[PDB]
Amino acid sequence: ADLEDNMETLNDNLKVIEKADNAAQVKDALTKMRAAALDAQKATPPKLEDKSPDSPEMWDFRHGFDHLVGHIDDALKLANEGKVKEAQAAAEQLKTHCNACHQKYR
Ligand code: HEC
Ligand SMILES: [Ca+2]
Ligand SMILES: [Ca+2]
Ligand SMILES: [Ca+2]
Ligand SMILES: [Ca+2]
Numbered sequence: 001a002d003l004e005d006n007m008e009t010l011n012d013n014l015k016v017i018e019k020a021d022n023a024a025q026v027k028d029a030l031t032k033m034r035a036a037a038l039d040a041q042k043a044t045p046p047k048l049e050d051k052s053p054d055s056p057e058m059w060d061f062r063h064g065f066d067h068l069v070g071h072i073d074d075a076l077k078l079a080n081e082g083k084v085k086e087a088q089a090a091a092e093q094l095k096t097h098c099n100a101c102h103q104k105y106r
């Protein structure tokens with residue numbers, strides 16, 4: 001999957017998590033979100049295509065997904081213990097990091 005597909009996976013599973021009814025639905029959504037974020041991390045955003053792959057902007061873009069994965073992992077620990085409401089709250093707090101990267105590179 002390319003970068004925009006990974007981003008659509010993140011956006012879709014976000015809406016899934018807030019509409020979810022049980023911990024299984026939340027755990028499956030977070031697992032796909034983890035893979036999409038790690039896959040997106042290997043991509044180059046169109047706005048940075050004329051920058052070097054080694055540029056500080058590209059490393060900042062990659063580091064943003066490291067932090068996002070950390071939050072998905074923390075939310076995964078909550079969903080694995082049946083705490084769907086806590087997991088839904090954690091998944092809602094991803095949005096501040098979604099927006100912060102987008103303001104720079106989207
Ligand atoms: C930087 C480390 C990012 C974080 C974290 C998130 N997004 Fe993202 N997003 C990023 C870029 C550089 C782009 C543009 C890519 C392109 O090919 O144009 C996007 C785009 C989106 C989109 C629109 C997809 C499209 O077809 O253009 C959506 C709906 C989107 N992003 C959602 C999204 C969500 C829900 C995130 C948190 C889970 C998130 N993004 C994080 C860069 C980064
Ligand atoms: Ca891919
Ligand atoms: Ca697009
Ligand atoms: Ca595509
Ligand atoms: Ca698509």
Ligand SMILES: [Ca+2]
Pocket residue numbers: 019020021
């Ligand atoms: Ca529902």
Ligand SMILES: [Ca+2]
Pocket residue numbers: 081
């Ligand atoms: Ca327990």
Ligand SMILES: [Cl-]
Pocket residue numbers: 082083084085086
């Ligand atoms: Cl709960």
Ligand SMILES: [Co+2]
Pocket residue numbers: 067071097
């Ligand atoms: Co954070």
